Specification:
The PDB classes it as cell cycle. The entry lists the keywords Chromosome, kinetochore, cell division, centromere. The structure is cut from a larger assembly and holds chains A and B. Chain A is mainly α. Chain A is built from 2 helices and no strands. Chain A is 72% helix and 0% strand. Chain A starts with a helix and ends with a helix. Chain B contains 2 helices and 4 strands. In chain B, strand 1 and strand 2 (17-23) form a beta hairpin. The longest helix of chain B has 11 residues, at 59-69. Chain B is α+β, with helices and mostly antiparallel strands. The chains are: A mainly alpha, B alpha+beta.
Chain lengths: 53, 104
């Protein structure tokens, strides 16, 4: 029954329509988030130092 | 204080010369060791030689650093480029003619 309802949900997702969007694979979500957090902090502190000077 | 990541290496040799190797970088990149910049400075003289490798992006910053560290006010570039450093040294210091007439 689980595989049956899974295939049924696959069909229901196939019949659905949605405006297009774009992204990449799901394995690199947390890594990219951490890199973006680090880059944001670095850019913020650099901009703060430059502004103080 | 201008940039964030930058490597500077000094070498003080006789003939009153200081060799400076600079590896450039910014707040979001690491210093690039493949494209360095070489500077030869002569103490207490208004002249300094540089290797034209990548300073086209950071020329005003290098000029400011040179004119501040050496206690000067202005800096300008001469219309004299050459691959032979000794020839430039002899021409700029105008010591290519070393013959003087004397009876002694």
């Amino acid at each position: 029954h689980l595989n049956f309802l899974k295939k049924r949900l696959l069909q229901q997702c196939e019949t659905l329509k949605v405006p297009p969007k774009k992204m990449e694979d799901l394995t690199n979500v947390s890594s990219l988030l951490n890199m973006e957090r680090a880059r944001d902090k670095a850019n913020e502190e650099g901009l703060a130092l430059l502004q103080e000077e | 204080r201008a940039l964030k990541n930058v490597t500077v290496s000094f070498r003080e040799t006789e003939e009153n010369a200081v060799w400076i190797r600079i590896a450039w970088g910014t707040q979001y990149t690491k210093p690039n060791q493949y494209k360095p910049t070489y500077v030869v400075y002569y103490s207490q003289t208004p002249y300094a030689f540089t290797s034209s490798s990548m300073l086209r992006r950071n020329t005003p910053l290098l000029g400011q650093a040179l004119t501040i560290a050496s206690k000067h006010h202005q800096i300008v570039k001469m219309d004299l480029r050459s691959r032979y450093l000794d020839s430039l040294k002899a021409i700029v210091f105008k010591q290519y003619n070393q013959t003087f007439e004397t009876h002694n």
